[PDB]
Amino acid sequence: MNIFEMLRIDEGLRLKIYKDTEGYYTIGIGHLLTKSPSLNAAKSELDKAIGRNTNGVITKDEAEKLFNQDVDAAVRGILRNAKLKPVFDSLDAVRRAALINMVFQMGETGVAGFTNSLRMLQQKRWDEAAVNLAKSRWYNQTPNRAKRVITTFRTGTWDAYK
């Protein structure tokens, strides 16, 4: 297991524009296109992202290309963020992937605001951090996925993805 396999499990693979769990136009492996309710706006973002006229459909290789860019972008966001980088640097590789997962889903700014959870993670108070992480809109709206990510923070194992 690794961050790419982890996020493929959590995000799936769809080659046509679909709406994600928040109702937003998405494609590929969790590649958010736009929060606009306009399908034409999402198609325009998609064409720009892929570099050709797609009319809403892409290939598996194209989906994996956006996925690599998006994982890269999550790591880049963590390392440039004054709140996330110390936490990330403090963690083992399995728990680092749990943090990348959260940033992929909610964005750098969203996760950086989890101030109390981030502190419990930095203190390595794993059960307390896990309890705090679940007191969130994130957990209530996507509980099965949040439970997998939280179990990864709590244990430092891949047991929730086996």
Domains, the chain, ordered by start: 3-161 (1.10.530.40)
Q: Give CA–CA dist 25/131, Å, rounded.
A: 31
- In degrees, rounded to 5, the angle at the alpha carbon of residue 112 between the alpha carbons of residues 110 and 118 is 125
Q: Is 20 designated active site?
A: yes
Judged on CB neighbours under 10 Å (0-12, 13-18, 19+), 108 is buried
- 11, 45, 62, 108: the catalytic one is 11
Coil, strand or helix at 1 = coil
| Phi, then psi, of 120 in degrees rounded to 5 | -65, -35
DSSP state of 92: -
Q: Is 121 annotated as a binding residue?
A: no
Q: Is 104 annotated as a binding residue?
A: yes
Rounded to whole angstroms, what are the CA distances from 111 to 7, 101, 103? Answer: 16, 10, 6
Q: Which of 68, 61, 56, 57 is nearest to 30 (CA)?
A: 68
Q: Is 10 designated active site?
A: no
Q: Is 32 annotated as a binding residue?
A: yes
Beta strands in the chain (DSSP E): 14-19, 25-28, 31-32
User: Tokens 């769809």 belong to which residue?
Assistant: 14
